[PDB]
Amino acid sequence: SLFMSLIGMAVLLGIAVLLSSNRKAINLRTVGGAFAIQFSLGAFILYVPWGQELLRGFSDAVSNVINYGNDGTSFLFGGLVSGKMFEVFGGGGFIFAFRVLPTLIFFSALISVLYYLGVMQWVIRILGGGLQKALGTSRAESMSAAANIFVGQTEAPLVVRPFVPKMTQSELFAVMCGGLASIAGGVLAGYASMGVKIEYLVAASFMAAPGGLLFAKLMMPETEKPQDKPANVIDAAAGGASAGLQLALNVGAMLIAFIGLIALINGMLGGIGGWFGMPELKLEMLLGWLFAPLAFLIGVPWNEATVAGEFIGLKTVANEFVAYSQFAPYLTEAAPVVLSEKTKAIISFALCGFANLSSIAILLGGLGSLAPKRRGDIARMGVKAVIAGTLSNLMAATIAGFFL
Amino acid sequence: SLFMSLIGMAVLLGIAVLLSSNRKAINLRTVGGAFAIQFSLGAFILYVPWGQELLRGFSDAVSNVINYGNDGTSFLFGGLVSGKMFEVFGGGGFIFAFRVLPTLIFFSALISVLYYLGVMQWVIRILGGGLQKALGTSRAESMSAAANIFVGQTEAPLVVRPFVPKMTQSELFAVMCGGLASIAGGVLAGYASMGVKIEYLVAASFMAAPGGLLFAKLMMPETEKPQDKPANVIDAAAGGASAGLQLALNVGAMLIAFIGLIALINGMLGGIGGWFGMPELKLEMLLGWLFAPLAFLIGVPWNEATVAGEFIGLKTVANEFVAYSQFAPYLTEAAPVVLSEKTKAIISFALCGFANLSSIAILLGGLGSLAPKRRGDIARMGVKAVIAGTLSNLMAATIAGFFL
Amino acid sequence: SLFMSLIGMAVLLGIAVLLSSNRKAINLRTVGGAFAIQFSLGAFILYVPWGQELLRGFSDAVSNVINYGNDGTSFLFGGLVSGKMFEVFGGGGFIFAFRVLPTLIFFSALISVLYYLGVMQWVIRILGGGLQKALGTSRAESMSAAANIFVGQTEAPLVVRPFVPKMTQSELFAVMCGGLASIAGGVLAGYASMGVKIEYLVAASFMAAPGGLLFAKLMMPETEKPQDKPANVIDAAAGGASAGLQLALNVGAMLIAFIGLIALINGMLGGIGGWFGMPELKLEMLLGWLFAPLAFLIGVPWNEATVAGEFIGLKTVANEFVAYSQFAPYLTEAAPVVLSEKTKAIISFALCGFANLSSIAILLGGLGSLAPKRRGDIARMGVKAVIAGTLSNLMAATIAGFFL
Ligand SMILES: CCCCCCCCCCO[C@@H]1O[C@H](CO)[C@@H](O[C@H]2O[C@H](CO)[C@@H](O)[C@H](O)[C@H]2O)[C@H](O)[C@H]1O
Ligand SMILES: CCCCCCCCCCO[C@@H]1O[C@H](CO)[C@@H](O[C@H]2O[C@H](CO)[C@@H](O)[C@H](O)[C@H]2O)[C@H](O)[C@H]1O
Ligand SMILES: CCCCCCCCCCO[C@@H]1O[C@H](CO)[C@@H](O[C@H]2O[C@H](CO)[C@@H](O)[C@H](O)[C@H]2O)[C@H](O)[C@H]1O
Ligand SMILES: O=c1ncccn1[C@@H]1O[C@H](CO)[C@@H](O)[C@H]1O
Ligand SMILES: O=c1ncccn1[C@@H]1O[C@H](CO)[C@@H](O)[C@H]1O
Ligand SMILES: O=c1ncccn1[C@@H]1O[C@H](CO)[C@@H](O)[C@H]1O
Ligand code: NA
Ligand code: NA
Ligand code: NA
Secondary structure (H helix, E strand, C coil): CCHHHHHHHHHHHHHHHHCCCCHHHCCHHHHHHHHHHHHHHHHHHHCCHHHHHHHHHHHHHHHHHHHHHHHHHHHHHHHHHCCHHHHHHHHHHCCHHHHCHHHHHHHHHHHHHHHHCCHHHHHHHHHHHHHHHHHCCCHHHHHHHHHCCCCCCCCHHHHHHHHCCCCCHHHHHHHHHHHHHCCCHHHHHHHHCCCCCHHHHHHHHHHHHHHHHHHHHHHCCCCCCCCCCCCCHHHHHHHHHHHHHHHHHHHHHHHHHHHHHHHHHHHHHHHHHHCCCCCCCCHHHHHHHHHHHHHHHCCCCHHHHHHHHHHHHHHHHCCHHHHHHHHHHHHCCCCCCCCCHHHHHHHHHHHCCCCCCHHHHHHHHHHHHCCHHHHHHHHHHHHHHHHHHHHHHHHHHHHHHHCC | CCHHHHHHHHHHHHHHHHCCCCHHHCCHHHHHHHHHHHHHHHHHHHCCHHHHHHHHHHHHHHHHHHHHHHHHHHHHHHHHHCCHHHHHHHHHHCCHHHHCHHHHHHHHHHHHHHHHCCHHHHHHHHHHHHHHHHHCCCHHHHHHHHHCCCCCCCCHHHHHHHHCCCCCHHHHHHHHHHHHHCCCHHHHHHHHCCCCCHHHHHHHHHHHHHHHHHHHHHHCCCCCCCCCCCCCHHHHHHHHHHHHHHHHHHHHHHHHHHHHHHHHHHHHHHHHHHCCCCCCCCHHHHHHHHHHHHHHHCCCCHHHHHHHHHHHHHHHHCCHHHHHHHHHHHHCCCCCCCCCHHHHHHHHHHHCCCCCCHHHHHHHHHHHHCCHHHHHHHHHHHHHHHHHHHHHHHHHHHHHHHCC | CCHHHHHHHHHHHHHHHHCCCCHHHCCHHHHHHHHHHHHHHHHHHHCCHHHHHHHHHHHHHHHHHHHHHHHHHHHHHHHHHCCHHHHHHHHHHCCHHHHCHHHHHHHHHHHHHHHHCCHHHHHHHHHHHHHHHHHCCCHHHHHHHHHCCCCCCCCHHHHHHHHCCCCCHHHHHHHHHHHHHCCCHHHHHHHHCCCCCHHHHHHHHHHHHHHHHHHHHHHCCCCCCCCCCCCCHHHHHHHHHHHHHHHHHHHHHHHHHHHHHHHHHHHHHHHHHHCCCCCCCCHHHHHHHHHHHHHHHCCCCHHHHHHHHHHHHHHHHCCHHHHHHHHHHHHCCCCCCCCCHHHHHHHHHHHCCCCCCHHHHHHHHHHHHCCHHHHHHHHHHHHHHHHHHHHHHHHHHHHHHHCC
16 A cells, blocks of 8 residues: 555665765765655645645646637637637647647746746745755755756756766766756646646655755766856747747657657557567557556556556657657546556656656757866766656655555 | 828827937938928829829729639639638638738749849839939948838848948938838738728838838938948749748747737736626737827827727737738628728838837848848837837828828 | 660760869779669669569568658548549549648658657668778768658758768768769659659669769769768657648749749740740740750650750759659650650659759758858759759660660
8 A cells, every 4th residue: 555655756766876986975964864855845735734735836837827828829810729620620639739839939938037037046046045944955956956846957057057077976966867857847838738737746846956966966976075137028938939939849850750660660569569469569568568567566457557668668769749649648537547546646747857868969969068078977977867757756646646 | 080190190290309319410401302202192092083083093903913823722722722711610711821822922932033023123213213302311221221122121131232331320221211111012912912992002102102211311310421142033033932931930920829818918908807797808908008198199080099099009919910901801791890991001101110129139130141240220210220120110091081 | 776875975975064163183993883883773673673663662661652652632522532533623633732742741750750769760871881892981971861761951961960070072072972972862752652653763862972072972973081860769650740730831832933934934935936826835845855866865765855955954944843843744644745655754864863054052050050061062062062063863764774
């Protein structure tokens, strides 16, 4: 029952220690408090009444911002995003390109505005400050952790960019992990626009800040000594819109290609598999069969572990956006397999993260531009940081399933 | 009656003199003739029969070019831009993304072709030469003024780019003002595709050349001494298409974000306003209430000044593209408020200009790349140049309303 | 009958010799074997039974990959690419922007993957090696020839990029010609998605490798002495997707502008032509009237030579993508002129090539970046290389019509 979850949490911690760079250098206060916060935060907003009300209150505000932004895309694409689309095309009336992608544009502009007004820096300074006083982590790596709740892995270190070129290997690794453990505000609203419960997305985004530091300081403890703008608000929105547009195009091209490639792979796997009496062999079968123990370990029922593995596996070997796209039909009344509400929550939390191999290349570009002489260290710690980010997402899912 | 318009023209001139860098250095021949041309040009093509026929003749040619270009977008988006769209989605059958944006691509390619053939340089040389002989303005600043009738604020100085790094502060300011007072050929056809009367757009584009110089030489008189390609036609079209595409994407992202942001602001203004007994408070109400005196001053009737202020205000605090997008429904039979034909003309002229704060950043990029050591002067004169450009648009509207 | 084709082949060879840089330096083994291979390859896969089966087998595999990739665009654009589109908009239900353009994205990602796995380098090394052993051409120029079968003119030299800056003028010219004589895998599937028979596209792509070398070594014989990566597979796909997206946007903007420009030209040609009693004068009439002898020479019947000339002419003076777009309606049951199956094949082969003037600018960018000190030689040999590429496409069409 609940005993299988606590074992899950133990196993995840165990792997991180086995993969640590120095188990004897692990700060017990740091990693103890880090797990304490993520677990308590999970308990707070998923179990206790007052915490649940604050979460559903924040989520409804996020849901209101999404609808407001939809006025923009409604103007541009008109009746192609209206209700008449469902009367004509039925299910295919929902055009992903016009329904989900424009959200990335609006939210990138909004967060750009919130940075200009100092609202973002205000929240980050509070959360980032609470972490470093409780965990003993450095100032810079804690701010980047807190920022990563709302923005992406390449945008979060920007709030501490003059400290990045000279921060320690453990600091840099943590910064990498904070980005891999979390997502971004823009894609968040995208996933929400696909049917993913906002309550789970907001919850997972916040639990990423302590969770990211947790596995950063487990797998790479501090063995060194750390240290220590647009002209107007309209320009900020325009710049954010531009950045969002570029991101929207990239995600769209990736989804067309990757899905197309998976369709090509499934065709080949059917022919190759047929040679071994398995003509029905697909990529989803391999991934499900391979990740089922991992899904079963984080709290997914035995009879649903394989289907859960398909999504968790797809997120790891590609990215969370593709995983969510294949998991979204399972959130409607036209779902091929009716899953339990607890399993739906676990997958939602386990997928909520940029933790994949492709993000290393993205970290080399973004985070590497802030410190060009540190691109070697980033590439070297890349895979370890991806694993650490994966453990953080899996821990958050285990915690989530435990309190649900 | 007509007395309120002439007062309007006087007030606008008055503000420019009060904000001048040296009232004693103002060249009476320059600013006298500049106003004389803009006023006479307004009289010519809006009042006298022969001038009205030349304007409607040029506009019908512009309207024919638009339809020819529509063959391109009709090929790409097929039935999504056909008449069947209105039978199915009704009003929402008009998809802005496919109906207006592709025009920017076609017209950018066409103007690129016209530059290659020397047709553009031919017209600019005549109009630019007539201005400098009548106003006494320098050669370079006059060519940039004439070019700005047809192209954008960053493209117009390109016809005199080797003279920009060494031109006087008054010359540079004028170049900045010529761009802010006018629009571009590409967006022109876009506004026309939204229901804005082409006759008003062409008229305002031409009146921008003397009007831009007028307020440039009022607010910043000359106190110094001024001085003095693609391989084939198919390459020119391709390059122009590419530039148009990039612009089309930017405008689209901006419209999605800005409209979405306004929707978000109106939601917040309803809550904040509710604290003061004004739950119906919106951005349009603030802008209308604040710009109504200005609209009333340029010739808009008292009972229509507030609605007119909403659009003029939105153009100033954001850009003219967003203003036109909110003003276009007022040009159809489904308009929420039926406005007088004179008020519709005034708003059309007052909106026709790139005069906004965001254009300073764009001027720093485009015009600043032509003279990197002059980016300080551009940023310093930015706001003054925006005001000057605003006065030029307001003057053109007052003149327009006077002869109508 | 078949005598008119062999005359055609002779004439094409004749022009190349007349335009040669040194007729006395032409290697008879090189150009003899080069024509021998292209002619035999044509005989193999268009005439002999076994060769026809291998071609239709490869084409059905290409047709299967296309459909697999379509799962990606089907996810993004939903019902806008469904069968319901034809029930509502009829013929206009086929939206080119969503039906053809996304193919460039998928195929660019796939070929990027195939390069990473070493599959591309494996095939190129075999075909490129067979050519240089049979023709006596250099190693580098032969690999670029073989690569050009599957990829574009700027991508093909990348497999021999450290040998490009120091290769001979004849080598560089051949590299330029190999790219101009062929197309790319991505646009190939695009043309196939417009109704162009895949069998003709695959055939022409392969016959371009010897055909490109053939006219390279005729018009520019060797008079000198020649010499002699993404972190993971998912990164490769993502990079290829990005490159495909950029290309998809460019092609789309070009098609909107060029078609729009042609519509504008036809309007002007109707007025200008009206002055000489020819109000029905259009661009298609001029191009058809001017290229009809050329089409008649390559095997197109007298009564179909003029219509065939319209398409061949449009490909030359613009690009093959625009030509195919105007030729595609002639491949359906709603064709304005029912053409013979042999004429449809000839046009398909004659159009299959990047041979146009605009590609010189593209060669200056791509191939010129690999050897910046050789941009002068590229620009100098540009037009000659375009002619050579045109002759290669015309030869392939003549050969095709001969065996059909
Ligand atoms: C959808 C509608 C929303 C309604 C909200 C309207 C907001 C109004 C924006 C005004 O902001 C100002 O704009 C200036 C222009 O960019 C800035 O000056 C900046 O640039 C000037 C010159 O360009 C310099 O003089 C200054 O030093 C520099 O602060 C200045 O910082 C900024 O405060
Ligand atoms: C929709 C259909 C429209 C129908 C219209 C057809 C127009 C025909 C275009 C031909 O233009 C020529 O093309 C050359 C190739 O770019 C240019 O040579 C340029 O480039 C050459 C080599 O690339 C150099 O030899 C030259 O010096 C240099 O002028 C040359 O300037 C230009 O006149
Ligand atoms: C749609 C689903 C498809 C299913 C297929 C799944 C394929 C699995 C990809 C794994 O590939 C590895 O990924 C590493 C990470 O990029 C690479 O390490 C590279 O980068 C490392 C660090 O980033 C370095 O340690 C290495 O030196 C360097 O080889 C490595 O080369 C590569 O073999
Ligand atoms: O780096 C990112 N920043 C913002 C949004 C997205 N991504 C990247 O793109 C992917 C898809 O959302 C993520 O897994 C991540 O690697
Ligand atoms: O600078 C520009 N050049 C061409 C088109 C548009 N714009 C900018 O974008 C805005 C929207 O049309 C203008 O206000 C102007 O600042
Ligand atoms: O250079 C290219 N590489 C890949 C795809 C396309 N093109 C260019 O764009 C044109 C349209 O397919 C070609 O004629 C060619 O010049
Ligand atoms: Na993040
Ligand atoms: Na202008
Ligand atoms: Na090629």
